[PDB]
Structure formats: structure tokens, C-alpha cells
Design a protein around this ligand. Structure first.
Ligand SMILES: [Mg+2]
Ligand SMILES: [Mg+2]
Ligand SMILES: [Mg+2]
Ligand SMILES: [Mg+2]
Ligand SMILES: [Mg+2]
Ligand SMILES: [Mg+2]
Ligand SMILES: [Mg+2]
Ligand SMILES: [Mg+2]
Ligand SMILES: [Mg+2]
Ligand SMILES: [Mg+2]
Ligand SMILES: [Mg+2]
Ligand SMILES: [Mg+2]
Lengths: 91, 148, 101, 120, 85, 177, 99
RNA sequence: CCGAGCCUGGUGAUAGCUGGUUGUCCAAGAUAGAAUCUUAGUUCAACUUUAAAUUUGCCCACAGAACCAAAUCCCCUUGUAAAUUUAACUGUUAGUCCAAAGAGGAACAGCUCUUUGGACACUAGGAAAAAACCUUGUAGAGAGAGUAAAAAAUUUAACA
RNA sequence: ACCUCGAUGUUGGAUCAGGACAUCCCGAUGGUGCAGCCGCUAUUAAAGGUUCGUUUGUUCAACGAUUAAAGUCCUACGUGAU
RNA sequence: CCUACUUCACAAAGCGCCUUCCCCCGUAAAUGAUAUCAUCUCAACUUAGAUACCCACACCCAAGAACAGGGUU
């Protein structure tokens, strides 16, 4: 072939087998059923308005509150004194 | 890798499960320094846990030596003569309980690669395949292009 | 997976089963049972009142140390990990069969 | 220029041949979608990758329940080539707090709120 | 053969839901049932949070429609009650 | 069952001489069966490193039947390494020179391209005629079935087979043939 | 690096080796591989490839009975799709419903 | 070894240039530009990183954005969880191919130059081999399973 | 401007040539405005062959004498560790 | 290959001698259907259409870089 098979002006040919046709067809059928089930909403756009504003508001209060509660951890005496047991002996 | 390391087949010691189960671990040998931070969690293992361990399985005899060592060891010796020496150097008490329980649970086989995940000694029950299974006989045992 | 099993044999599993060494196990989910002159294959499993498969735990080992190296050329990407999985070995003690058909 | 693509509304208006082919009802439609990502969002634009993150479809072949409302359906109309949409049908009722753990969603699309492991 | 299993209401993968992966794998020989499998515990947590999402979304849908209907009845009463004086 | 170790092991891995008639048969559809029985891919004890192939004797390899014009179109090309020694020879001419090499080149193309291929070719015996030597006739076990059912000609249909088939059309009374 | 990339190839080559063994031993009983596997799936006998290769080697009566069960179910599929419309189902063509 | 000796010293000259830059493990992380004796480089921006404060960020619906095509901006809901700001700087700023809309060339180039979007410089499977095409991303062990992409099809001229 | 600037060494000639046929000669045919001889054109064929000198560094070109013919090219404008 | 001639001489050479063996496939015509004539036929069909060679210590050599080879009656 003139150069680098798959890019360029003179590319080598590639042909569509029966595998690739049946694959593309069953993808189109799954797609067309997605086109069926998106054609019938349970609400209009007026009816859905504000139906989850409370839960979205409380969810962002949870994210906002998790953001504004970030601070260094507590420092204890028992950890620092607990280091002293590295020279614990027997007798 | 597996081609540089030896391999073996999955076995047991003396058919370890068939009649009765025998604990394969004979001796543990702790050597624990009295003064030394290396054998601290060993000492806390002897003060706390080696007695309850020694009672949970009485077929194991345990030798705590308590010499001035600089790295503490535990030496598991198994019924088949295998001796696995592992270090408890700077390990906490819980990690020595899981380590000693790990040595107790296993056997004196090598920890080299095991080839098959299974070991039947009677693999075939209906008779093994040979090329004359699934071939019908002919009359008088005749072969092709044989007249008489 | 699906282990083909007689009595008096061994299986090496690749996990710890939180059991003591020596405890007896009834293996449920048997799904084919054969003898010399008959079999019994269920859809997909067999009845628990029909087949009783028993197995003890022998040894709770680790695996041989298992190297996980990643390396990409000319990108200075070289990682080495060493992993030992846990393992238990099971001695299938008996396959008892029950006249319930 | 490859841009974002709009889709006209006649594409999403079903016909009685389609209402007979797929088992839907135009009067009294379904409430909940089961959505399943079945096509990788790599080699796809960034807005589609974003919508797939907004729908919780980051793992493939994992069902996700959404509402059958025009806003959720607008996001599903963006990535309709990447997903699979089925109605969530409920043979028995929606589960109470007694039957809350003993549920299982079947591959047909139904959420069976009493899930034994026993044959009939 | 998973398209057949989809036709039969089964899981497309036999390792999916059903009797091969959701019964306990082993029991004690005394008859004591085993402690539950880790994947069965995680999996029942997944099914439980999935069911919680189904209930939560269904309740937001019904409360949304009923709130719209009460807004429309209040709009109709604000239509009717100003028809005087 | 209930053998010893070495007789069971000898029984499982012993190799079987097959016979395979190639009269009116295409050489590639014989080459498929011969190739499978030479690699041991007809055994469930098959592994590529267990050396479990068999012997295959193909007889009547002068009576190869190509489909289509493959006798006149298909070209077997060798090159003796000398310059100008590129020798393209059709399948008809090569079948007239050596009446073994069409089935042989077909099987040698079917086998896996490794070092076991020529050992597997030395387990394959190609005879151009009905005559097979007696030390090979005393080895054969099974005759594999021919993969092409040979269609019969009008000398070979019986009269009940002819009368069972209907006359489809009436000729005119004045027609000459 | 070869040692870690060869674990995927160990699983792959074991599975293609099992499909070769099931293919060979099912050619001994007249079936082919896809008829055998598809029609063992359609009986809810969900044995995997490793087990069926091991039965193909060590227990060939069981593999012959699985071949007769799979070919029986294949012929019930042929006679089932042949006489379309409502007809009584096959005996091995029945499915066990779980709930 | 003389277009200006050789030695010592200044001298560790200077080098936007070349080459090299040594333990382990995890994480986040790639392509607008403007100036410049400048395009072999630097500075700022943009992007990236870490810490920190706060509250909106992204997707978006009606309405709306001019006279002489695809679409975009704007954008409540909704789905989500990120964004802005503050502190501290490094580094990338010499990109390639494909799809599409154009400009230049021959309606040439694995050609040059813009724009939009992918991909590659990151993993794997396929297209024969294969940076850029298709499938697919979150990492381990398994001698389990279901799948995704995926195999080129064609054969012809009588005539009164 | 894609490999090569931490080296892929340059035209003609010598020497050895390998290959293609889109044939210059030799072979076989069809047509011819082919009587014969010479030609012209087309089909098939690459087994074999395809000159020596004067000027010019010349491949080329012109010229001289022949030849059955003095082919067109590619091979890193073949081949300078020959 | 050395009998002559020549360079030359117990031989090697050419300027000397000796031997050298098969086709090409393009077409040109019979019979003859599809399409009852005809028609060379991507109809069935009929014509024009390789042997040889090779093969069982030591010393000298027409063999040879070494090794190998031939001869040693
Ligand atoms: Mg190329
Ligand atoms: Mg310097
Ligand atoms: Mg510079
Ligand atoms: Mg990372
Ligand atoms: Mg400059
Ligand atoms: Mg907004
Ligand atoms: Mg370019
Ligand atoms: Mg360029
Ligand atoms: Mg250079
Ligand atoms: Mg020609
Ligand atoms: Mg040159
Ligand atoms: Mg050279």
C-alpha cells in the first residue's frame, strides 16, 4: 500500500463482515428501544418543578457542612507518653 | 518467578485429614531478649498470650529461651522434620499472635509453588479415556482392508 | 469454581475461610454426582437431602511469594510488589448419597 | 466541526406500532427507569463523559434507578447511545421496611420484593 | 449462552444472581450454618441501598405530583374567590 | 479401569493408525481431517507438549477432486534459491509429476507452524493408489469417513430410482432431438 | 514483567485448551462444541469448561450421557422451533423457575 | 595540532547548547495565548499541584442575543458534587493523527495553517504486523463465568 | 521535511551483474493502403543475445564503421570495507 | 584438453584444439447444442498440443592452503 496502511490519501480498504453488520444492527435495536422509553415522561416539566428542592438543599448542606468542618485532629497525652514504652524492660 | 523457583504437588503429611487430624507443628522456640526494644512485643507476647496459646493446642511444646539476643526469632519445627525460622523483630503483640497462629495452622511442606490446586489419587472412577473407548468393535475383530 | 471431587482427596482454595484446622464442613452446592453406572445431575444444583459431601480443613497456608512488576519503557516506570495470598487445603472425607428420588 | 447534537421532538413521539412492539402504555406510563451503561465513554466527547458521571453510570453493566421526568430524560437523551433504558416494573408493591433487605432486581426489569432461593 | 438466560428471566451470567451464588457455599457438619459470605453481605447491602433508592425516588415522585395538584387547586380557588365585590 | 499404572498410561497415549480413502475427495477437506488426527486434536488427552498425535494413511491420492477450476488455476510455487529458479507450476502439472504432493502440501499448510510439524508429517503416509504395503495394512484400526459424499452418475442410478423420479414435461410428438 | 503478564495468558490458554478437549471428545460422540455447550446451558446444567474437560478425560460415560442430554435437548429445540405455535413442550426442555 | 605559540594564573571562564542526574511505595497530573535582537529561550496568563476558607459549581427550560448551516451564549428546575476565593510555588507552554467545517497548494502529500471533538504520549482486546481507527479505563490472586470490538463480497456482450 | 547532521561517502567509467517487460534482435500468430522483398501495427514469449572507436570528465549528443540487434528501465541516479 | 602451433617445457596455459541435445500456447481449423441453420467450445468434445553424472604408519601423487582424496604389487 502507498504508506502507513490506515491513515492518508491511499488507505488500504477494510470491509464490513456479517459480524460487524449484526453488531451494528443489535446496537441500533437497543437504541430504538431507548427511543421508545424516552417518549413517555411520568410528569410534565411544570409538574416536576421543585419536587426535590428540599432534598437537594439538604444534600448541599451536607457537602457544605463537610467542607466547613475540616481542622487539625486532637492531640492526646497518652500517645506522647505511650512512646516511652520503647524502652520497656523486664526484671 | 516460577521457572527459577522449584515446584511441588499439593499433598499432606500422612494423609492428614482421613482418619484424624494431627497438628503438624511440634515445637515453637522463642528467643526473647530481656532488655531490648527489638523483643518488646515478644516480651508482651510472653506475658500475655503465649500461655493461652500454649493451652489452646497442647500438642505443641514451646521453648521460650530468654537470652540476650539482638534480633528475636521464633523457630517452628514440624512433624516431618521441617524447620521454619521466622523473625519477630519489632512486631507488635497482635502481629505475633497472627504470625504464631499462622505457623500453627500450616504444615511442614515447602512454601514453593504448588502445581495443581487439587490432588486426587483416584482421579478416574468410570475408567480413564483410551482411544478405544468410544470406538465400536467390528465383527471378527477385522481392521480396514482386511478380507478374512 | 467447580471442583471435581472424590472422597479421600484434596482441594487448595485461595482464601482463608475463618475456620479452625480440622473442622468438618458440609459442602453444599454440589451439582453433579456420578458412580460407575449412573450419574445424577441437577438443575442446576442437587437436593441437600440427596447428596452429603464432607470435608475437613487440613492446613491454612500462604501461597508462594508472588511478584507483581510493572514496567514501561523510556518513561521511568518500574514498580515491584510481592504478594502472598492465603490458602486453605480441604480433605474431602466422604461423599454419601441418599435414596431420595 | 463536530459539535453537540440536538434531536427533534418527532424522534421521541412513539407510534402504536411501537406501542405494540414494546410493552408500553402511553396512558399511565412508568415511574422509574433502569439505566445501564453498555458502551464506554472513552472515544466520546467530554460532555457525554460528564453526563455519565452525573447519572452514576461510571461502572458498566450496573443498573441505576432514575426518575421518568423531562430533566432526567434530557440527560438520558444526551447519552442515549451509551446506555440501556428499561422501565422499572414492580409486580408486587414497592418494598416496605419489613421487606427492605430481602429484595432482588431481576434481569427482566422487575424488583421482586420477596426473594427466596427456592424452586417453585 | 446468555441470551437464552435473558429469555428465561435468569441472570445473563450464571455467576450472577440465583442459586449458584446466593446459597451458602458450606455449612458445619453438625448442622450449624456458616457465617455469611463477604460478597453476599456486600451484595445484600447493594440490593438494600438500591431498594432504598427505589422507595425514595417513588416517594419524591408522588409527593411532587400531589404538591402540584395542591398548587393547582389553590390557583383555582384564587381564581374563584376574587370573582366578587 | 482397574489397570496398573504403566498399562493404563500406555493405553491412554498409544497412537492409532487411521486409514482414509481419498477417491473423488477434495484435498483440503481431507487435509482438515488428516491434520486433526496428526496433531492429536481428536483426543481429549490432547496437549501440544504430550506428543499425542497419531498416524494417518491416505490412500488413492491420485484421485483427488478439486472443486471448480482449481486444477487449472491453483499455482504451486517453489523457489530453488538460485537466481531465476522461481518455479510456478499449476496443480494439474504438479499432480502429474508427483501424485502425492497436493494432499501433502495441503496437510503441511494445515499443521501448526512449529517444530512438531515435520514430525507430524512423518506420521503421515500418502499412497497414490489402492496398494498399501503389508506392514502398514497390519497397523490400521479405523477407516475415517469420507468428508464428501460422492455424487453418482446415470450408470449408477437403479431403475427404481429412475422410476421414482417423475417425468417433468411432455415433448412434442414431432421433435427430432 | 513476563511473569505478571502471563497470568492472563495462563487463564486464557487453560480455557482454550479446555475448549480443545471438549471439542475433541464431543466430536467423538458426533456433536460439535457449540451444540454441546449451548444445549447444556439450555438444560440448566451449568457445568463449566474445566469440569467438562475433566469428565471428557476421566469419566467418559458421564460425558457420553451429557452428550446424549445435550443432543436430546438440541433435537427438542429443532422439533420445538419446527412445529411453531402452541404445542406441548419438551420433557428436558422444561425450565426450573426459582423465586 | 600558528588566521596568531606554549605554560601558569584570573578559572570551578561562560554555555538559552549536548550529555548525565543514584533507595522503596502510593496519590493528583497533558496542549488557550501575549510580549520578547524572539520563536533552541524567558516572563506573565492558562492548565496542573498542595494546604485553607466559604458557597455555590456542572448539566441546564420558558423567555432572550442585528441589520447589512451544525450549533453557541444565557439559563430556574433536575441529576449530581464540585466550584470560587485565599496562601505557596514548580512544571508544561518546539505536539502528532483521525472525524468534521474552512484557508493555502494540484478540489497533491504521512503537506502547511485555523476551529470543534476524539485518541496517543497510560492500560488491555481487535484491525495481520500496528503511537493516532474500533472496543475498553481504577489496578491483587483464581486451573471460574457472561460479554465488547472483531472473518469482505463480486464474474460480465449470440441473434433475426 | 518523515529516518539519518555522536557521518546513510558524489557523477561517469571499470568489474560482476540480479530483476521487470511497457520486446531492440531471434521464436510463434492476426491485420495490412500485405503480389514477392522490405515494411507498419497488434497478440504471445524474457530461454539466449544486445559492438568497437574519434571529440567531450561526461551520462547524453554528434560523427565513423558494423551488427540479427546495438531496448526501455528499476536495483541507495545497483555495486568506492572491490 | 595438450597431439601439434605459440608463451613455454619434466607441467601450466591461449593466440590452439574438442564437444554442446526439448518445447512453448498466440492462434488456425473439424463435429456440434444453448438459439434444431450456423458457430474453433469460459458447452460437452476432436486436432496442431529431461536424461545423463554421482553411487563399494610412512612415502609418492596428475589430489591438495590445512584436513580430506588417489596410488604404494
Ligand atoms: Mg505504508
Ligand atoms: Mg559549565
Ligand atoms: Mg535561546
Ligand atoms: Mg495516578
Ligand atoms: Mg534569538
Ligand atoms: Mg445555574
Ligand atoms: Mg502533519
Ligand atoms: Mg512536516
Ligand atoms: Mg546528517
Ligand atoms: Mg508482452
Ligand atoms: Mg548510486
Ligand atoms: Mg559496499
Amino acid at each position: 500500500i502507498p504508506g502507513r496502511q490506515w491513515i492518508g490519501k491511499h488507505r488500504r480498504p477494510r470491509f464490513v463482515s456479517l459480524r460487524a453488520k449484526q453488531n451494528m444492527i443489535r446496537r441500533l435495536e437497543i437504541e430504538a428501544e431507548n427511543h421508545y422509553w424516552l417518549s413517555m415522561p411520568y410528569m410534565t416539566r411544570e409538574q416536576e418543578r421543585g419536587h426535590a428542592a428540599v432534598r437537594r438543599r439538604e444534600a448541599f448542606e451536607a457537602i457544605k457542612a463537610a467542607a466547613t468542618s475540616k481542622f487539625p485532629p486532637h492531640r492526646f497525652i497518652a500517645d506522647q507518653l505511650d512512646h516511652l514504652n520503647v524502652t520497656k524492660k523486664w526484671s | 518467578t516460577a521457572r527459577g523457583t522449584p515446584s511441588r504437588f499439593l499433598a499432606s503429611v500422612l494423609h492428614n485429614g482421613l482418619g484424624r487430624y494431627v497438628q503438624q507443628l511440634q515445637r515453637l522456640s522463642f528467643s526473647v531478649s530481656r532488655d531490648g526494644a527489638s523483643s518488646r512485643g515478644a516480651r508482651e507476647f510472653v506475658e500475655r498470650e503465649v500461655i493461652d496459646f500454649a493451652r489452646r493446642n497442647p500438642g505443641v511444646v514451646i521453648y521460650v529461651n530468654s537470652r540476650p539476643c539482638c534480633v528475636p526469632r521464633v523457630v517452628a519445627e514440624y512433624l516431618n522434620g521441617a524447620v521454619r525460622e521466622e523473625s519477630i523483630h519489632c512486631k507488635s503483640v497482635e502481629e505475633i499472635s497472627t504470625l504464631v497462629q499462622k505457623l500453627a495452622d500450616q504444615s511442614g511442606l515447602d512454601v514453593i509453588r504448588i502445581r495443581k490446586p487439587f490432588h486426587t489419587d483416584n482421579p478416574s472412577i468410570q475408567g480413564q479415556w483410551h482411544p478405544f473407548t468410544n470406538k465400536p468393535t467390528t465383527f471378527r475383530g477385522l481392521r480396514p482392508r482386511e478380507v478374512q | 469454581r467447580q471442583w471435581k471431587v472424590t472422597s479421600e482427596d484434596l482441594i487448595l482454595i485461595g482464601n482463608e475461610l475463618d475456620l479452625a484446622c480440622g473442622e468438618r464442613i458440609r459442602l453444599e452446592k454440589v451439582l453433579l454426582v456420578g458412580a460407575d453406572n449412573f450419574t445424577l445431575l441437577g438443575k442446576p444444583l442437587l437436593g441437600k437431602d440427596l447428596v452429603r459431601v464432607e470435608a475437613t480443613v487440613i492446613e491454612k497456608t500462604e501461597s508462594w511469594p508472588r511478584i507483581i512488576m510493572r514496567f514501561r519503557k523510556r518513561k521511568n516506570f518500574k514498580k515491584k510488589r510481592i504478594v502472598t495470598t492465603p490458602q486453605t487445603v480441604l480433605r474431602i472425607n466422604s461423599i454419601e448419597i441418599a435414596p431420595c428420588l | 466541526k463536530f459539535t453537540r447534537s440536538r434531536i427533534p421532538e418527532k424522534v421521541f413521539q412513539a407510534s402504536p406500532e411501537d406501542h405494540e412492539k414494546y410493552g408500553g402504555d402511553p396512558q399511565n406510563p412508568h415511574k422509574l427507569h433502569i439505566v445501564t451503561r453498555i458502551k464506554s465513554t472513552r472515544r466520546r466527547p467530554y460532555w457525554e463523559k460528564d453526563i455519565i458521571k452525573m447519572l452514576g453510570l461510571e461502572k458498566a453493566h450496573t443498573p441505576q434507578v432514575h426518575k421518568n421526568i423531562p430533566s432526567v430524560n434530557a440527560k438520558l437523551k444526551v447519552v442515549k447511545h451509551l446506555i440501556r433504558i428499561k422501565p422499572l416494573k414492580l409486580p408486587q408493591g414497592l418494598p416496605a421496611e419489613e421487606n427492605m433487605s430481602n429484595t432482588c432486581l431481576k434481569s427482566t426489569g422487575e424488583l421482586v420484593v420477596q426473594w427466596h432461593l427456592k424452586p417453585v | 449462552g446468555g441470551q437464552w438466560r435473558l429469555q428465561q428471566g435468569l441472570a445473563a451470567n450464571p455467576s450472577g444472581y440465583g442459586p449458584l451464588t446466593e446459597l451458602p457455599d458450606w455449612s458445619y457438619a453438625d448442622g450449624r450454618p456458616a457465617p455469611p459470605m463477604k460478597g453476599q453481605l456486600r451484595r445484600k447491602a447493594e440490593r438494600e441501598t438500591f431498594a432504598r433508592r427505589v422507595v425514595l425516588l417513588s416517594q419524591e415522585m408522588d409527593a411532587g405530583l400531589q404538591a402540584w395538584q395542591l398548587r393547582q387547586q389553590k390557583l383555582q380557588e384564587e381564581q374563584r374567590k376574587q370573582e366578587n365585590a | 479401569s482397574s489397570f496398573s499404572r504403566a498399562p493404563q498410561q500406555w493405553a491412554t497415549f498409544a497412537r492409532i493408525w487411521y486409514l482414509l480413502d481419498g477417491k473423488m475427495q477434495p484435498p483440503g477437506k481431507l487435509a482438515a481431517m488428516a491434520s486433526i488426527r496428526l496433531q492429536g486434536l481428536h483426543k481429549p488427552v490432547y496437549h501440544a507438549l504430550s506428543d499425542c498425535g497419531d498416524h494417518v494413511v491416505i490412500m488413492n491420492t491420485r484421485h483427488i477432486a478439486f472443486s471448480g477450476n482449481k486444477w487449472e488455476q491453483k499455482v504451486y510455487s517453489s523457489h530453488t534459491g538460485y537466481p531465476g529458479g522461481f518455479r510456478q507450476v499449476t496443480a494439474a502439472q504438479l499432480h502429474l509429476r508427483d501424485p502425492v504432493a497436493i494432499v501433502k502440501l495441503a496437510i503441511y499448510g494445515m499443521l501448526p507452524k512449529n517444530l512438531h510439524r515435520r514430525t507430524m508429517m512423518e506420521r503421515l503416509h500418502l499412497f497414490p493408489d489402492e496398494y498399501i504395503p503389508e506392514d502398514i495394512l497390519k497397523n490400521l484400526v479405523e477407516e475415517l469417513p469420507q468428508p464428501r459424499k460422492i455424487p453418482k452418475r446415470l450408470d449408477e442410478y437403479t431403475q427404481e430410482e429412475i422410476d421414482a423420479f417423475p417425468r417433468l414435461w411432455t415433448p412434442p410428438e414431432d421433435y427430432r432431438l | 514483567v513476563k511473569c505478571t503478564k502471563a497470568r492472563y495468558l495462563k487463564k486464557k490458554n487453560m480455557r482454550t485448551l479446555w475448549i480443545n478437549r471438549i471439542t475433541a471428545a464431543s466430536q467423538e460422540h458426533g456433536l460439535k462444541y457449540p451444540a454441546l455447550i449451548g444445549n447444556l446451558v439450555k438444560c440448566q446444567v451449568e457445568l463449566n469448561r474445566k469440569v467438562l474437560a475433566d469428565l471428557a478425560i476421566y469419566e467418559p460415560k458421564t460425558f457420553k450421557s451429557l452428550a446424549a442430554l445435550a443432543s436430546r435437548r438440541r433435537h427438542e429445540g429443532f422439533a420445538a422451533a419446527l412445529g411453531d405455535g402452541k404445542e406441548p413442550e419438551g420433557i428436558f426442555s422444561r425450565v426450573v423457575q426459582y423465586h
